[PDB]
């Protein structure tokens, strides 16, 4: 028990001898098992199908080929002579079918643009260090399971896995390999006390002895002790960067998963919005982007108090009347209390009652006995401001030199800043990014915390109304549609006169009577494309093209250009991985650096070919705080005619800088998936969009967060799998899908305490944003109490 480096190293060398011995035993075992499991040949025919066929060697007009045979014998393969040549007749067989036009990758359809992660370049159509590190990682994995049995065997004071980790953490190379907060978390699981002086000494000698025996810099297969210790399951999470993240600090901390991940646009917690950083850390487009819970909640309160002037719950309501609580149940009561706030019509008691399994008089008993205090909210004085000379937000009109004064309508030059969430007027003096972050001011949008009352930059929709068609590119009214002028589609909430509320609703997408009048500026939201069909292009040297399958009138929406949203650098990497530097990347936001890549995921628009005199025209549109690409017909187009647009500058070289029928055409047409050839007059194939692969990716993205508890992941993934399928971009439709969710998942929600708790945090966060009407919370109380009642059947 008087150890030296020499003695430990000699002992490790002897223990190491079992590694090749175990390996030889393992491989021989696996080989013997596999030999025993050889398969019997299957599907054998009863008779020899070749038995009747004789040699075709020739003993007129038939093609003929030579074969020279040689015979060999012995151990050396010596030929018995120089060979005998024979002639054979040839059976010539033609194929009956041409190949389909060429393509790369399996092309799959997406309903909306999806957000790509940055990829690595591991292959192109320092190497020496990739090779060496792979070899070392394999050896490290081989040695890792031996460390603890060897340490038990050596039984050296202070030479335990935990103490070798503490020693590793204390050494200088941990500065060359770790960070502040990582040390912090290491020395909370481990601390830096390593025991007696002899223990500290032995741990140092063991580490040195290991690196001498196993980390010789002469070998390709070398592993430092540190390499094995970083594999430890309590160590590796600390070097894992997949991290999601009085009275009010408790509520803020409780709702943090929801304020951080919850998308402001589509209400999912893993979705296609937000920004991907270069290391694929994601900034979600969430409440945290606009100040977290408090600036939005404070405004809710202020507006709640600035209103100065139904049936009781069926859970023994405190409005008629009026078992120890856990702190979870108290916490639940708090955040519901704080986010319901100074409500006239909605009260925490009943909803908290349905969330927990408790009667409505109970949580009032607990509520009164706890007496929770809402911070005081000052009256928010709005300091009056001049209207702008180029935009009148009450007549909903642009005037004067608006095209020179703002870049609101100029998407190619826009940069994406967080919607403004400062406390004052939206001016350069206050650092409002909408007024001042860009070369010109842009309008404040629906996620800016300012109101239309206060802010003269605040977009308020268009004023169009007509019993006929309106919100048109060339308006007959004599007052133009401001939305069209701003290159944006109408907002289902703000554009109240034109019927966008109904026409931007995908559930009415095929109500042709509805869409024959009113707003004609929601085509991307409507989500209905003209009938089109894939085929072989008429242009020689093109492969595929896209063909109209129905008549299209000039000015009609045709299709959206969908694909993966990528950065400039990702576009360059992809072009190099694909061999090109044939790579078509549609510029979505030039200045911001966002391209749409349809090489793999997109829709049939990816096949539309280039022509100088096209019959359709792309346009980038602002759509509820997404930017999207629509195509519009610029000529009348007949069924069967090929579509074309002028590629213009849309695809930069990034490194160098009335049933639906198959139409009659001369060109062959194809089912996009089976590639079967379509015949004229057959029903046109329209396959529903297969999205389960994409839902799985979003589920797994949440599952990978290290700082989410299993109870949170479970609920977040249930809500996301539901809400992602509705492709929401307007809060106008959230209450409907919220209520459908509560009804379909009622039984599930009340079956398990954490599900109701997490659901209440969602509800609380959406209440705090005033995006969820109070009436749906009331109704949700009924649904949950109903289901809890129906569950009392044990």
């Amino acid at each position: 028990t008087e150890w030296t480096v020499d003695k430990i190293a000699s002992a490790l060398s002897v223990l190491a001898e079992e590694v090749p011995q175990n390996h030889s035993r393992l491989v021989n075992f696996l080989l013997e098992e596999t030999e025993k499991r050889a398969p019997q040949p299957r599907h054998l025919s009863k008779t020899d199908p070749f038995a009747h066929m004789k040699s075709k060697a020739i003993d007129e007009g038939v093609p003929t080929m030579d074969v020279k045979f040689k015979q060999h014998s012995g151990e050396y393969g010596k030929s018995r002579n120089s060979g005998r040549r024979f002639q054979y007749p040839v059976v010539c067989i033609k194929p009956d079918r041409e190949p389909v036009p060429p393509y790369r990758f399996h092309h799959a359809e997406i309903r909306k643009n999806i957000l790509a992660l940055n990829s690595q370049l591991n292959f192109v159509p320092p190497r020496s260090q990739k090779i060496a590190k792979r070899a070392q990682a394999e050896y490290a994995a081989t040695l890792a399971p031996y460390l603890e049995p060897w340490l038990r065997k050596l039984n050296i004071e202070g030479c335990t896995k935990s103490n070798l980790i503490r020693f590793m953490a204390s050494q200088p190379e941990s500065d060359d390999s770790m960070t502040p907060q990582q040390k912090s978390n290491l020395l909370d699981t481990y601390s830096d006390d390593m025991g007696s002086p002899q223990a500290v000494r032995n741990a140092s000698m063991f580490t040195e002895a290991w690196d001498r025996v196993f980390n010789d810099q002469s070998k390709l297969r070398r592993v430092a002790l540190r390499d094995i210790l970083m594999l430890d399951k309590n160590v590796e999470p600390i070097f894992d960067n997949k991290r999601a993240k009085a009275l009010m600090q408790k509520v803020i901390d409780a709702l943090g998963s929801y304020t951080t991940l919850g998308c402001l646009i589509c209400f999912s917690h893993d979705c296609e919005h937000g920004e991907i950083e270069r290391d694929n850390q994601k900034r979600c487009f969430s409440l945290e982007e606009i100040g977290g819970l408090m600036p939005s909640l404070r405004r809710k309160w202020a507006a709640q108090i600035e209103q100065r002037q139904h049936p009781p719950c069926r859970n023994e309501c405190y409005r008629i009347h009026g078992p120890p609580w856990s702190e979870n149940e108290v916490g639940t009561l708090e955040w519901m209390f704080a986010t319901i706030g100074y409500s006239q019509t909605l009260r925490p008691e009943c909803f908290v009652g349905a969330i927990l399994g408790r009667p409505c008089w109970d949580v009032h008993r607990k509520l009164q006995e706890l007496d929770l205090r809402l911070p005081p909210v000052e009256p928010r004085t709005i300091p009056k401001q001049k209207s702008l000379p180029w935009y009148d937000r009450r007549k909903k009109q642009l005037m004067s030199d608006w095209a020179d004064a703002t870049i609101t309508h100029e998407h190619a030059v826009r940069e994406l800043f967080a919607p403004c969430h400062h406390d004052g007027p939206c001016t350069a003096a206050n650092g409002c990014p909408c007024a001042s972050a860009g070369t010109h001011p842009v309008l404040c949008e629906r996620f800016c915390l300012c109101t239309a009352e206060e802010c003269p930059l605040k977009f308020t929709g268009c004023a169009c109304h007509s019993s006929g068609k309106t919100c048109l590119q060339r308006q007959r009214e004599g007052r133009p549609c401001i939305c069209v002028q701003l290159n944006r589609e109408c907002d289902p909430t703000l554009c109240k006169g034109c019927g966008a509320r109904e026409r931007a609703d995908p559930e009415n997408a095929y109500d042709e009577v509805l869409h024959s009048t009113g707003c004609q500026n929601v085509a991307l939201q409507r989500g209905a494309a003209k009938a089109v069909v894939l085929g072989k292009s008429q242009l020689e040297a093109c492969g595929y093209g896209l063909f109209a399958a129905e008549d299209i009138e000039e000015g009609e929406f045709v299709i959206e250009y969908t694909g993966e949203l990528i950065s400039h650098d990702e576009g360059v990497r992809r072009a190099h991985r694909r061999g090109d530097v044939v790579s078509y990347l549609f510029t979505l936001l030039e200045q911001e650096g966002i391209w749409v890549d349809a090489a793999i995921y997109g829709n049939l628009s990816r096949y539309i070919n280039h022509a100088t005199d096209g019959n359709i025209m792309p346009k980038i549109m602002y759509v509820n705080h997404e930017w999207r690409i629509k195509f519009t017909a610029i000529k009348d187009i007949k069924a069967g005619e090929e579509l074309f647009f002028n590629y213009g500058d849309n695809f930069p070289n990034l490194t160098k800088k009335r049933p639906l029928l198959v139409p009659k055409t001369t060109q062959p047409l194809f089912d996009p998936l089976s590639k079967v050839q379509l015949l004229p007059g057959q029903p046109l194939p329209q396959h529903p969009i297969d999205d389960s692969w994409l839902l799985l990716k979003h589920r797994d993205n949440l599952q990978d967060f290290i700082d989410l508890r299993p109870e949170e992941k479970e609920f977040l993934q249930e809500w996301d799998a539901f809400i992602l399928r509705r492709h929401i971009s307007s809060e106008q439709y959230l209450p409907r899908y919220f209520l459908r969710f509560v009804r379909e998942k009622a039984d599930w929600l009340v079956s398990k305490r954490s599900r109701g708790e997490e659901f209440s945090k969602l509800v609380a966060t959406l209440l705090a944003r005033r995006v969820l009407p109070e009436r749906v919370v009331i109704e949700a109380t009924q649904v949950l109490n109903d289901a809890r009642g129906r569950l009392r059947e044990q």
Binding site: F69, V91, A144
Partner: protein, 468 residues
Amino acid sequence: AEWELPRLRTSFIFQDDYKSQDLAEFFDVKFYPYSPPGAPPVFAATSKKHAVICRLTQTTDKDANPCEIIQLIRDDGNEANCASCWSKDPITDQPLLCIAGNEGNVKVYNVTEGKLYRTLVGHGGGINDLATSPANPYIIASASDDTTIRIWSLAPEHEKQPCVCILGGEGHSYDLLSVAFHDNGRYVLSAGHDQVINLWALPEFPNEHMEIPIVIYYPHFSSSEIHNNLVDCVAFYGDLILSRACHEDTIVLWRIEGFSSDDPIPGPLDAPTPTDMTKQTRSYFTPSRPAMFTRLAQFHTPDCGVQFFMRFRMYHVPGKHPILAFANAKSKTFFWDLARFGEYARFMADLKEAQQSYNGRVVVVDQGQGISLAQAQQVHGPGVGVVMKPAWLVPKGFSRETLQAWADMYDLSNPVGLIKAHRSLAIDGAFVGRQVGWSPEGEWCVVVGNGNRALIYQRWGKERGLGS
């Protein structure tokens, strides 16, 4: 007899059919797998323009020709070919030969009657490999430059739309070179230029018309880390994996941790998804952070140079030794008998054991004579330790050189060692192997390659002493 390895018996050169006067090659050879047990073995060799169909018959005359060409088919189209597999007519049970090439179509030939059965159309680029499911002879997989695998059914219910499955998504990003089925017909391996080996789990396919193929977006195991170069040949060996890459001069034996074909087949929504783009290995199967695969052994195949599209073949049938064969880019054919590894290990253990319990006083006697572990113990009695050595363990007390030669061929203790071939046969002239095939009873092994050359190896022969 069970320890015999092949020797060269017949070779032929087929007339150059890509004329340039000899840059034609045989790219594939496949023995017909559905004949009654014992029937004369038949193989097809596929050149760029022809399918050469031969029957092999064993002969007592050493000067006779065991190889007769019974069918010779020319692809009378513009496609040049490099891949083949066998199937059967689902109505008539006649052999069907599938052939595919640089236009992206599979041609299915009725070989006995010499006509086209049908064409399988749909790939977006050249096809580099074909494999038939061992569980269903009407199911075939094709691997393409378009980076996808397509699964086809020749069953009559699928006649109008015969693509039942597409393996797509982002698992592969460049031309595919190799596709292989597990014996259970439900797991598929794919690999190619992107250096990724993917293992996919196929659903069950309805026995009715499928208007669209099922699309699979995610492999259940994916790794670019077993090799450091393009991968041009993969196969299952039981549940183990064999694979080779360009520039490495090895065939790697390895396994996926936690993978067993006795477990239930996972469904497509159990597959892992690439949530972390820095991870080059991911696995549904995974059972200190665990490795997702283990390198087990490397068979040394020297002198492949920079050549790629070179395929190996295992002979694996119940009751016979498993034999790995492969031909390199420099006129050599290699064999390993996988049963030798266990017998060597047994011998070395018996040898070491007797060295201790007899202080070094041990006698080694060859198996395969009239002598037994009994008749040899009668010659010296309990004073000596007698250890039986396999006859194929030949030297050069054993010397260090002898022990080192034996370990180079049979020692399995080092996963990054190099296992020397158990037999290495020189080929006359300059030759690059493209494919190896085995007859059903293992008595014939056919290697094909450049110069439209076929090399035909035999064991358990019937020859009886000159006949010309």
